[PDB]
Design a protein around this ligand. Sequence first.
Ligand SMILES: [Ca+2]
Ligand SMILES: [Ca+2]
Ligand SMILES: [Ca+2]
Lengths: 137, 137
Amino acid sequence: GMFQLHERLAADTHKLGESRLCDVLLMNDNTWPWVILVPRVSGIREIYELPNEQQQRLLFESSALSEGMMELFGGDKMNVAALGNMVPQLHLHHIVRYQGDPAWPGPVWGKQPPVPYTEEQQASVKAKLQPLLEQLA
Amino acid sequence: GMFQLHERLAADTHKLGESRLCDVLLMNDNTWPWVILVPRVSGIREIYELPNEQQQRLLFESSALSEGMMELFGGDKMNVAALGNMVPQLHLHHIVRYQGDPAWPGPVWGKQPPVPYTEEQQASVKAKLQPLLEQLA
Ligand SMILES: [Ca+2]
Ligand SMILES: [Ca+2]
Ligand SMILES: [Ca+2]
């Protein structure tokens, strides 16, 4: 069917760009570098519900994004997850972690309130990510 | 090099068996149905560090495991993640969620100390998972 980004994902993110398969979204919490891939395929709840070739494309994009974010943000560890307990539209979290970050070594989700990006922080991180995003096209 | 299961993973789990690529581990917490895939390749921290063909095999196994667990445990939603902030050996979590389960709708990690399976509970869940384990060969 006709893919439409879920309203909660739209509300919680800024759009960074588009890969071949996915919308590339910045989670609007500047506490951690946090990018979401949303495959533009209607009605998908789980990775396994994608056709095999689209699973493999998502993997290619996710692995390329993760490795690139690690270098770009000088991270200590990646966290990658598909959760979706309250948003049924499949989306894949990519979060750069640091031994010095506020949640370490636990998970980030629900640790503390989000801090929205300022205009200049949003533009800076979008710009920083464009080379990597172009790799995903 | 010579793969060796990380001591913390060994301590926290019961080994169900092996897939083509991985150790298939039961997380030793009966609070949620939770199985961990550990690729049997030394020195890997992140999915993207595997050779592409092992990344694709891990994906296949993860998707087969997840879809199978959903039907076997009558789940509402899967949660799949590679975190590894404490344990550097790549391992991929697969947790069956139900509406209203413990910690719902948040993620499970760090929300309760584990409750070990008793001998009899371990035998039950092992028997329940055996067909699906075999599908990962
Ligand atoms: Ca938005
Ligand atoms: Ca292919
Ligand atoms: Ca063990």
